[PDB]
mmCIF file of C-alpha atoms in Angstrom:
data_model
loop_
_atom_site.group_PDB
_atom_site.id
_atom_site.type_symbol
_atom_site.label_atom_id
_atom_site.label_comp_id
_atom_site.label_asym_id
_atom_site.label_seq_id
_atom_site.Cartn_x
_atom_site.Cartn_y
_atom_site.Cartn_z
ATOM 1 C CA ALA V 1 55.556 -10.181 -122.567
ATOM 2 C CA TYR V 2 54.730 -6.800 -123.851
ATOM 3 C CA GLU V 3 56.196 -4.057 -122.066
ATOM 4 C CA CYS V 4 54.838 -0.835 -123.810
ATOM 5 C CA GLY V 5 51.594 0.529 -126.198
ATOM 6 C CA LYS V 6 49.317 -0.391 -127.953
ATOM 7 C CA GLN V 7 50.208 -4.481 -127.346
ATOM 8 C CA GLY V 8 51.369 -3.479 -123.711
ATOM 9 C CA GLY V 9 47.527 -1.996 -122.323
ATOM 10 C CA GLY V 10 49.090 1.509 -123.145
ATOM 11 C CA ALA V 11 51.617 1.670 -121.022
ATOM 12 C CA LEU V 12 54.651 4.467 -120.738
ATOM 13 C CA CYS V 13 58.084 2.765 -120.580
ATOM 14 C CA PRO V 14 60.434 4.609 -117.783
ATOM 15 C CA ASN V 15 63.080 7.063 -117.912
ATOM 16 C CA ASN V 16 62.247 8.304 -121.819
ATOM 17 C CA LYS V 17 62.708 4.475 -123.308
ATOM 18 C CA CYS V 18 61.312 4.520 -126.433
ATOM 19 C CA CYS V 19 58.365 2.089 -127.080
ATOM 20 C CA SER V 20 58.740 0.043 -130.126
ATOM 21 C CA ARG V 21 56.402 -0.906 -132.836
ATOM 22 C CA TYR V 22 56.246 -4.171 -131.739
ATOM 23 C CA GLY V 23 55.788 -2.563 -127.638
ATOM 24 C CA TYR V 24 59.016 -3.310 -126.256
ATOM 25 C CA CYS V 25 61.314 -0.529 -123.993
ATOM 26 C CA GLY V 26 64.555 0.561 -125.540
ATOM 27 C CA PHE V 27 66.741 2.813 -127.417
ATOM 28 C CA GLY V 28 68.058 2.741 -130.902
ATOM 29 C CA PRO V 29 66.686 3.130 -134.212
ATOM 30 C CA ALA V 30 64.530 -0.486 -133.739
ATOM 31 C CA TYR V 31 62.457 1.655 -130.519
ATOM 32 C CA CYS V 32 62.767 5.423 -131.674
ATOM 33 C CA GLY V 33 62.434 5.196 -135.090
ATOM 34 C CA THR V 34 59.401 4.155 -137.339
ATOM 35 C CA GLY V 35 56.544 3.161 -135.560
ATOM 36 C CA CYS V 36 58.124 4.016 -132.071
ATOM 37 C CA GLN V 37 54.792 4.502 -129.729
ATOM 38 C CA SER V 38 56.082 6.343 -127.131
ATOM 39 C CA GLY V 39 58.881 7.912 -125.347
ATOM 40 C CA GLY V 40 62.242 9.753 -126.561
ATOM 41 C CA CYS V 41 60.924 8.731 -130.525
ATOM 42 C CA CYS V 42 63.062 10.204 -133.324
ATOM 43 C CA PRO V 43 62.119 12.186 -135.160
ATOM 44 C CA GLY V 44 59.742 12.720 -132.416
ATOM 45 C CA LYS V 45 55.723 11.758 -132.584
ATOM 46 C CA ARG V 46 53.468 14.125 -134.232
ATOM 47 C CA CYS V 47 51.112 16.542 -131.764
ATOM 48 C CA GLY V 48 48.863 18.797 -131.867
ATOM 49 C CA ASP V 49 47.575 20.691 -134.493
ATOM 50 C CA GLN V 50 49.504 18.228 -136.630
ATOM 51 C CA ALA V 51 47.620 15.028 -135.240
ATOM 52 C CA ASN V 52 44.528 15.852 -134.882
ATOM 53 C CA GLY V 53 45.059 17.207 -130.905
ATOM 54 C CA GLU V 54 46.808 14.135 -129.975
ATOM 55 C CA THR V 55 49.043 15.536 -126.631
ATOM 56 C CA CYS V 56 52.793 14.191 -126.367
ATOM 57 C CA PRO V 57 53.132 10.514 -124.528
ATOM 58 C CA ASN V 58 55.504 11.307 -121.658
ATOM 59 C CA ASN V 59 54.489 14.643 -121.109
ATOM 60 C CA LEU V 60 57.081 15.540 -124.236
ATOM 61 C CA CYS V 61 56.205 19.186 -125.131
ATOM 62 C CA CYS V 62 55.223 19.911 -127.980
ATOM 63 C CA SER V 63 56.669 21.700 -130.629
ATOM 64 C CA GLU V 64 55.260 25.077 -133.016
ATOM 65 C CA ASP V 65 55.944 22.290 -136.042
ATOM 66 C CA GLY V 66 54.235 19.514 -133.993
ATOM 67 C CA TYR V 67 56.571 17.197 -133.251
ATOM 68 C CA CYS V 68 57.333 15.582 -129.492
ATOM 69 C CA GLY V 69 60.606 16.557 -128.076
ATOM 70 C CA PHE V 70 62.583 19.080 -124.532
ATOM 71 C CA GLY V 71 64.125 21.663 -125.041
ATOM 72 C CA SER V 72 63.725 25.676 -126.458
ATOM 73 C CA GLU V 73 62.760 24.248 -129.331
ATOM 74 C CA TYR V 74 59.788 21.950 -128.542
ATOM 75 C CA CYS V 75 58.382 23.670 -124.588
ATOM 76 C CA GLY V 76 59.593 27.256 -125.313
ATOM 77 C CA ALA V 77 58.503 30.127 -128.061
ATOM 78 C CA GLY V 78 55.770 27.952 -129.948
ATOM 79 C CA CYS V 79 54.772 25.126 -127.284
ATOM 80 C CA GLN V 80 51.405 23.719 -128.065
ATOM 81 C CA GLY V 81 51.199 20.716 -125.795
ATOM 82 C CA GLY V 82 53.179 19.321 -122.691
ATOM 83 C CA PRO V 83 54.751 21.506 -120.071
ATOM 84 C CA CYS V 84 55.495 24.088 -121.979
ATOM 85 C CA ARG V 85 57.624 26.840 -120.337
ATOM 86 C CA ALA V 86 54.690 29.574 -121.062
ATOM 87 C CA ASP V 87 52.216 29.372 -117.867
ATOM 88 C CA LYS V 88 48.781 27.381 -118.708
ATOM 89 C CA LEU V 89 45.781 28.628 -117.757
ATOM 90 C CA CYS V 90 42.243 26.576 -117.624
ATOM 91 C CA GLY V 91 38.766 26.886 -115.942
ATOM 92 C CA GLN V 97 39.091 24.322 -120.647
ATOM 93 C CA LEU V 98 39.970 21.422 -118.771
ATOM 94 C CA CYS V 99 43.758 20.949 -117.915
ATOM 95 C CA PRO V 100 45.331 18.229 -120.794
ATOM 96 C CA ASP V 101 46.314 15.175 -119.556
ATOM 97 C CA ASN V 102 44.484 14.862 -116.558
ATOM 98 C CA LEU V 103 46.794 17.807 -115.382
ATOM 99 C CA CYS V 104 45.260 19.777 -112.543
ATOM 100 C CA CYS V 105 42.806 22.991 -112.409
ATOM 101 C CA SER V 106 44.265 25.201 -109.696
ATOM 102 C CA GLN V 107 42.090 27.389 -107.910
ATOM 103 C CA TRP V 108 44.000 30.412 -109.697
ATOM 104 C CA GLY V 109 43.179 29.260 -112.553
ATOM 105 C CA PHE V 110 46.705 27.318 -113.717
ATOM 106 C CA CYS V 111 47.120 23.760 -114.851
ATOM 107 C CA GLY V 112 49.847 21.685 -113.271
ATOM 108 C CA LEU V 113 50.938 18.759 -111.008
ATOM 109 C CA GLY V 114 51.184 18.594 -106.969
ATOM 110 C CA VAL V 115 49.883 20.112 -103.792
ATOM 111 C CA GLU V 116 49.604 23.766 -104.892
ATOM 112 C CA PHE V 117 47.879 22.597 -107.995
ATOM 113 C CA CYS V 118 45.536 19.119 -106.647
ATOM 114 C CA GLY V 119 45.371 19.842 -103.447
ATOM 115 C CA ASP V 120 42.923 22.407 -101.782
ATOM 116 C CA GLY V 121 40.778 24.573 -104.177
ATOM 117 C CA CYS V 122 41.680 22.395 -107.392
ATOM 118 C CA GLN V 123 39.092 22.179 -109.825
ATOM 119 C CA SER V 124 39.742 19.840 -111.712
ATOM 120 C CA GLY V 125 42.189 16.949 -113.166
ATOM 121 C CA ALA V 126 43.565 14.964 -110.216
ATOM 122 C CA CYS V 127 43.233 16.474 -107.404
ATOM 123 C CA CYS V 128 43.897 14.664 -104.313
ATOM 124 C CA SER V 129 40.631 14.871 -102.668
ATOM 125 C CA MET V 130 36.928 16.080 -104.406
ATOM 126 C CA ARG V 131 34.440 14.449 -102.723
ATOM 127 C CA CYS V 132 31.397 13.215 -104.805
ATOM 128 C CA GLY V 133 28.169 11.206 -104.460
ATOM 129 C CA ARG V 134 25.548 10.765 -101.659
ATOM 130 C CA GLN V 135 28.647 11.829 -99.325
ATOM 131 C CA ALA V 136 28.765 15.384 -100.489
ATOM 132 C CA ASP V 137 25.038 16.147 -101.713
ATOM 133 C CA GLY V 138 25.365 13.804 -105.311
ATOM 134 C CA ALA V 139 27.549 16.027 -106.600
ATOM 135 C CA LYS V 140 29.315 15.446 -109.677
ATOM 136 C CA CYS V 141 33.239 14.048 -110.609
ATOM 137 C CA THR V 142 34.653 16.128 -113.373
ATOM 138 C CA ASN V 143 36.946 14.836 -115.824
ATOM 139 C CA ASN V 144 34.619 11.837 -116.546
ATOM 140 C CA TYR V 145 36.006 10.372 -113.069
ATOM 141 C CA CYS V 146 34.100 7.477 -111.419
ATOM 142 C CA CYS V 147 32.128 8.512 -107.979
ATOM 143 C CA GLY V 148 34.120 5.710 -105.561
ATOM 144 C CA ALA V 149 31.932 3.770 -102.778
ATOM 145 C CA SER V 150 32.954 6.767 -100.020
ATOM 146 C CA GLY V 151 32.858 9.283 -102.211
ATOM 147 C CA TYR V 152 36.156 9.760 -103.567
ATOM 148 C CA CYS V 153 36.538 10.872 -107.113
ATOM 149 C CA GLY V 154 39.389 9.125 -109.097
ATOM 150 C CA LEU V 155 39.803 6.009 -111.628
ATOM 151 C CA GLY V 156 40.479 2.678 -111.920
ATOM 152 C CA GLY V 157 38.607 -0.123 -109.615
ATOM 153 C CA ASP V 158 38.424 1.146 -106.502
ATOM 154 C CA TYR V 159 36.881 3.923 -107.623
ATOM 155 C CA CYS V 160 34.785 2.892 -111.531
ATOM 156 C CA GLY V 161 33.968 -0.838 -109.891
ATOM 157 C CA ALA V 162 31.873 -2.101 -107.069
ATOM 158 C CA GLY V 163 30.292 0.775 -105.558
ATOM 159 C CA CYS V 164 31.120 3.485 -107.449
ATOM 160 C CA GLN V 165 27.661 6.027 -107.922
ATOM 161 C CA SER V 166 28.566 8.081 -110.963
ATOM 162 C CA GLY V 167 30.886 8.679 -113.903
ATOM 163 C CA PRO V 168 31.628 5.822 -116.164
ATOM 164 C CA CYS V 169 31.390 2.876 -113.634
ATOM 165 C CA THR V 170 31.703 -0.428 -114.775
ATOM 166 C CA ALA Y 1 47.711 -7.945 -114.635
ATOM 167 C CA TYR Y 2 49.886 -5.387 -112.894
ATOM 168 C CA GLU Y 3 50.543 -1.997 -114.915
ATOM 169 C CA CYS Y 4 53.233 -0.240 -113.801
ATOM 170 C CA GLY Y 5 55.494 0.432 -111.008
ATOM 171 C CA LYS Y 6 57.858 -2.581 -108.763
ATOM 172 C CA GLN Y 7 55.108 -5.045 -109.481
ATOM 173 C CA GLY Y 8 54.453 -4.166 -113.447
ATOM 174 C CA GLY Y 9 58.063 -3.852 -114.361
ATOM 175 C CA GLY Y 10 58.945 -0.482 -113.826
ATOM 176 C CA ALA Y 11 55.940 0.711 -116.193
ATOM 177 C CA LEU Y 12 54.326 4.248 -116.149
ATOM 178 C CA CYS Y 13 50.816 4.332 -116.364
ATOM 179 C CA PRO Y 14 49.817 6.901 -119.694
ATOM 180 C CA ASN Y 15 48.128 10.073 -118.950
ATOM 181 C CA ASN Y 16 49.755 11.095 -115.638
ATOM 182 C CA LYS Y 17 47.373 8.519 -114.049
ATOM 183 C CA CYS Y 18 49.146 7.553 -110.622
ATOM 184 C CA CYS Y 19 50.322 3.953 -109.919
ATOM 185 C CA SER Y 20 49.251 2.752 -106.938
ATOM 186 C CA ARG Y 21 51.327 0.992 -104.055
ATOM 187 C CA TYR Y 22 49.984 -2.292 -105.574
ATOM 188 C CA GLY Y 23 50.974 -1.461 -108.894
ATOM 189 C CA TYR Y 24 47.835 -0.503 -110.712
ATOM 190 C CA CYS Y 25 46.720 2.913 -112.659
ATOM 191 C CA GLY Y 26 44.138 5.178 -111.402
ATOM 192 C CA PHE Y 27 43.566 8.398 -109.737
ATOM 193 C CA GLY Y 28 42.251 9.557 -106.417
ATOM 194 C CA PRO Y 29 43.924 8.433 -103.033
ATOM 195 C CA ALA Y 30 44.106 5.206 -102.913
ATOM 196 C CA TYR Y 31 46.178 5.832 -106.547
ATOM 197 C CA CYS Y 32 48.052 8.739 -105.841
ATOM 198 C CA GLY Y 33 48.573 9.173 -102.380
ATOM 199 C CA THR Y 34 50.212 7.088 -99.669
ATOM 200 C CA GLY Y 35 52.535 4.617 -101.515
ATOM 201 C CA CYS Y 36 52.688 5.856 -104.896
ATOM 202 C CA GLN Y 37 55.190 5.158 -106.913
ATOM 203 C CA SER Y 38 54.390 7.432 -109.975
ATOM 204 C CA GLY Y 39 51.979 9.338 -111.991
ATOM 205 C CA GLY Y 40 50.573 12.975 -110.137
ATOM 206 C CA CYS Y 41 50.907 11.413 -106.948
ATOM 207 C CA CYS Y 42 49.739 13.910 -104.696
ATOM 208 C CA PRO Y 43 51.539 14.733 -102.201
ATOM 209 C CA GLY Y 44 54.364 14.542 -105.207
ATOM 210 C CA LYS Y 45 56.812 11.919 -104.773
ATOM 211 C CA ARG Y 46 60.025 13.151 -103.218
ATOM 212 C CA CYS Y 47 62.894 13.997 -105.825
ATOM 213 C CA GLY Y 48 66.133 15.771 -106.266
ATOM 214 C CA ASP Y 49 68.402 16.735 -103.349
ATOM 215 C CA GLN Y 50 65.691 15.810 -101.328
ATOM 216 C CA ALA Y 51 65.700 12.075 -102.625
ATOM 217 C CA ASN Y 52 69.120 11.024 -103.263
ATOM 218 C CA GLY Y 53 69.575 12.368 -106.376
ATOM 219 C CA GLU Y 54 66.537 10.366 -107.500
ATOM 220 C CA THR Y 55 64.560 12.338 -110.830
ATOM 221 C CA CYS Y 56 60.364 12.255 -111.160
ATOM 222 C CA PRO Y 57 59.224 9.568 -113.031
ATOM 223 C CA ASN Y 58 57.352 10.912 -115.762
ATOM 224 C CA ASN Y 59 59.211 13.547 -116.781
ATOM 225 C CA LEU Y 60 57.576 15.680 -113.731
ATOM 226 C CA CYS Y 61 59.822 18.904 -112.349
ATOM 227 C CA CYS Y 62 61.674 18.527 -109.468
ATOM 228 C CA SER Y 63 60.524 21.459 -107.283
ATOM 229 C CA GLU Y 64 63.263 23.572 -105.132
ATOM 230 C CA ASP Y 65 61.611 21.690 -101.789
ATOM 231 C CA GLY Y 66 61.988 18.347 -103.744
ATOM 232 C CA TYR Y 67 58.569 17.477 -104.482
ATOM 233 C CA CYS Y 68 57.606 16.445 -107.946
ATOM 234 C CA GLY Y 69 54.410 18.356 -110.098
ATOM 235 C CA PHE Y 70 54.302 20.886 -113.185
ATOM 236 C CA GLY Y 71 53.433 24.078 -112.947
ATOM 237 C CA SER Y 72 56.105 26.853 -112.018
ATOM 238 C CA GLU Y 73 56.079 26.726 -108.675
ATOM 239 C CA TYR Y 74 58.161 22.835 -110.092
ATOM 240 C CA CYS Y 75 59.730 23.744 -113.497
ATOM 241 C CA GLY Y 76 60.303 27.517 -112.601
ATOM 242 C CA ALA Y 77 62.680 29.159 -110.479
ATOM 243 C CA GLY Y 78 64.628 26.711 -108.157
ATOM 244 C CA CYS Y 79 63.807 23.712 -110.838
ATOM 245 C CA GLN Y 80 65.993 20.998 -109.802
ATOM 246 C CA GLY Y 81 64.756 18.237 -112.504
ATOM 247 C CA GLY Y 82 63.266 17.238 -115.055
ATOM 248 C CA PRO Y 83 62.006 19.610 -117.767
ATOM 249 C CA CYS Y 84 62.885 22.765 -116.221
ATOM 250 C CA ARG Y 85 61.891 26.163 -118.194
ATOM 251 C CA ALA Y 86 66.165 26.727 -118.261
ATOM 252 C CA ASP Y 87 67.606 25.448 -120.560
ATOM 253 C CA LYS Y 88 70.072 22.515 -119.612
ATOM 254 C CA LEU Y 89 73.529 22.553 -120.532
ATOM 255 C CA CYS Y 90 75.953 19.555 -121.013
ATOM 256 C CA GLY Y 91 79.154 18.172 -123.309
ATOM 257 C CA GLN Y 97 78.283 15.926 -118.386
ATOM 258 C CA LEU Y 98 75.487 13.424 -119.385
ATOM 259 C CA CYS Y 99 72.425 14.499 -119.597
ATOM 260 C CA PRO Y 100 69.555 12.971 -116.921
ATOM 261 C CA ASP Y 101 66.733 10.940 -117.967
ATOM 262 C CA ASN Y 102 68.918 10.099 -121.285
ATOM 263 C CA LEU Y 103 68.008 13.326 -122.442
ATOM 264 C CA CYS Y 104 70.004 13.688 -126.026
ATOM 265 C CA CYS Y 105 73.137 15.923 -125.817
ATOM 266 C CA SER Y 106 73.368 18.173 -128.710
ATOM 267 C CA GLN Y 107 76.069 19.001 -130.912
ATOM 268 C CA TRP Y 108 75.503 22.511 -129.144
ATOM 269 C CA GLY Y 109 75.811 20.840 -125.763
ATOM 270 C CA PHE Y 110 71.867 21.233 -124.642
ATOM 271 C CA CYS Y 111 69.740 18.776 -122.983
ATOM 272 C CA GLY Y 112 66.544 17.729 -125.155
ATOM 273 C CA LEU Y 113 64.924 15.352 -127.266
ATOM 274 C CA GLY Y 114 64.134 15.169 -131.310
ATOM 275 C CA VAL Y 115 65.939 15.500 -134.020
ATOM 276 C CA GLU Y 116 67.418 18.821 -132.854
ATOM 277 C CA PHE Y 117 69.250 17.073 -130.158
ATOM 278 C CA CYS Y 118 69.245 13.284 -130.639
ATOM 279 C CA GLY Y 119 69.828 13.694 -134.331
ATOM 280 C CA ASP Y 120 72.855 14.947 -136.424
ATOM 281 C CA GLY Y 121 76.185 15.586 -133.365
ATOM 282 C CA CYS Y 122 74.192 13.983 -130.772
ATOM 283 C CA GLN Y 123 77.063 13.810 -128.430
ATOM 284 C CA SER Y 124 75.024 11.232 -125.377
ATOM 285 C CA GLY Y 125 71.292 9.902 -124.732
ATOM 286 C CA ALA Y 126 69.642 8.183 -126.554
ATOM 287 C CA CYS Y 127 71.031 9.609 -129.665
ATOM 288 C CA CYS Y 128 68.832 8.552 -132.795
ATOM 289 C CA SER Y 129 71.756 6.609 -134.950
ATOM 290 C CA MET Y 130 75.548 6.427 -133.145
ATOM 291 C CA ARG Y 131 77.728 4.462 -134.373
ATOM 292 C CA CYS Y 132 79.762 2.242 -132.813
ATOM 293 C CA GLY Y 133 81.898 -1.020 -132.675
ATOM 294 C CA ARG Y 134 83.510 -3.058 -135.644
ATOM 295 C CA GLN Y 135 81.754 -0.345 -138.227
ATOM 296 C CA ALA Y 136 82.398 2.383 -136.148
ATOM 297 C CA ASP Y 137 86.193 1.626 -135.531
ATOM 298 C CA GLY Y 138 85.756 0.096 -132.815
ATOM 299 C CA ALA Y 139 83.941 3.328 -131.083
ATOM 300 C CA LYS Y 140 82.039 2.864 -127.247
ATOM 301 C CA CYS Y 141 78.506 3.766 -127.218
ATOM 302 C CA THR Y 142 78.119 6.539 -124.168
ATOM 303 C CA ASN Y 143 75.454 6.227 -120.766
ATOM 304 C CA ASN Y 144 76.158 2.793 -120.323
ATOM 305 C CA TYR Y 145 74.521 1.493 -123.628
ATOM 306 C CA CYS Y 146 74.935 -1.820 -125.980
ATOM 307 C CA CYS Y 147 76.207 -1.558 -129.440
ATOM 308 C CA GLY Y 148 73.958 -3.915 -131.218
ATOM 309 C CA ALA Y 149 75.094 -6.354 -134.173
ATOM 310 C CA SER Y 150 74.706 -3.811 -137.049
ATOM 311 C CA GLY Y 151 76.831 -0.995 -135.018
ATOM 312 C CA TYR Y 152 74.344 1.416 -133.581
ATOM 313 C CA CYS Y 153 74.235 2.448 -129.708
ATOM 314 C CA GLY Y 154 71.372 1.399 -128.339
ATOM 315 C CA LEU Y 155 69.500 -0.522 -125.078
ATOM 316 C CA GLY Y 156 66.752 -3.232 -125.114
ATOM 317 C CA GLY Y 157 66.737 -6.989 -126.287
ATOM 318 C CA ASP Y 158 67.819 -5.144 -129.873
ATOM 319 C CA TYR Y 159 71.270 -4.098 -128.310
ATOM 320 C CA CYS Y 160 72.152 -5.973 -126.010
ATOM 321 C CA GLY Y 161 70.824 -9.246 -126.423
ATOM 322 C CA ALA Y 162 72.077 -11.699 -129.377
ATOM 323 C CA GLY Y 163 75.646 -9.930 -131.136
ATOM 324 C CA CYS Y 164 76.165 -7.133 -128.774
ATOM 325 C CA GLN Y 165 79.263 -6.011 -129.453
ATOM 326 C CA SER Y 166 79.966 -3.739 -126.112
ATOM 327 C CA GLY Y 167 78.539 -2.419 -123.733
ATOM 328 C CA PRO Y 168 76.151 -4.365 -121.254
ATOM 329 C CA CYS Y 169 75.269 -7.307 -123.303
ATOM 330 C CA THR Y 170 73.950 -9.942 -121.592
#
C-alpha cells in the first residue's frame, strides 16, 4: 500500500507531494508537517551542514540556513545544495548523481551527460572487457555489454565490476 | 515490485535515478534512454511548449528548447519551467504545487508556504466549517478538521469540500 519514503523503498511523490511519516503522499499538515520525509515539507527538511551533509529530496534547494525549499531565499545567495542559481563546479563528484560535464560543471541533459561526461549519470559510459577493463565512476555497476549504470540490468547477471549482486 | 512511473503509481526514483520504460529505477541506457519516464533521462524528457505544457518530473528545469535538465543551459536564460534562476511571480497559481507567498512569489519552505500563503502547498490554510465555509485553492480537499490538503487524510473520510472521494 505504501507509496513513498522509508516504507516505500525510498520512492518520492510526484509534483512535490509530501511523504507523510507513514509513507503516503499528499499535502497539508498531516503530510508536510511533523515527520515529513520528502517533498514540499513545511518547514523544509534540514539539509547540508545542518544535517550531516544530506541533500534535499526532490531536487529542492538547501538554503544558507539549511532548510529545503525553492525561491530566492533557498536557491539564491548562500544556497548550499540542489539547483542553486550559481553554477556548480565538479572534477568532487556532483551530488545526487548529477553529470559532470567535460567542462567541469554539474547538470543533467545531453550537454552534461552526453559526449565528454566525466561522472554521474552519464548517457553512455563504457567499461569492462568492452573498454579495456575500464572502471565505472560513482560506484556504478559495469553491465554485461560494457555500459555503466545501476539497477538490475547492470548490477544483476553478467555484472563485471562495481557493486554487483 | 515496480518502483516508479506508470507501473509504480506515478512514484519518482530517489537521487535522480531514471525510471525505465518498465517502471524500475536505475542509470544507464536501459533506464535513462528510450522510454525513460522520469529522473535524469538522456536525452531529457520533452517539456513546456514542446510537450503540451507538461512540466519536468523531479523538479528538473525545462530549457528553451523544451528538454528537461539542470545547469545554466536548462535553468538559466530561456528556462520555461522548474526551478528557473529567475524569480517567479504569482497572485495566477504556481506550477507543480509551489506555494504562492503573501508577496506573490512562487517557492517552497515556510517563507512561501507559511503565514500568508495564498495557494499551492500551503502549510496550514484553513477551510470548511472552521473557516466559515472558505474554499481551498488548487482543487485541494478540505479535511474534517478544516485544513486544505491532498491525499487520504483530506480527500477521504470527513472531507468537506473539493474533490472528495
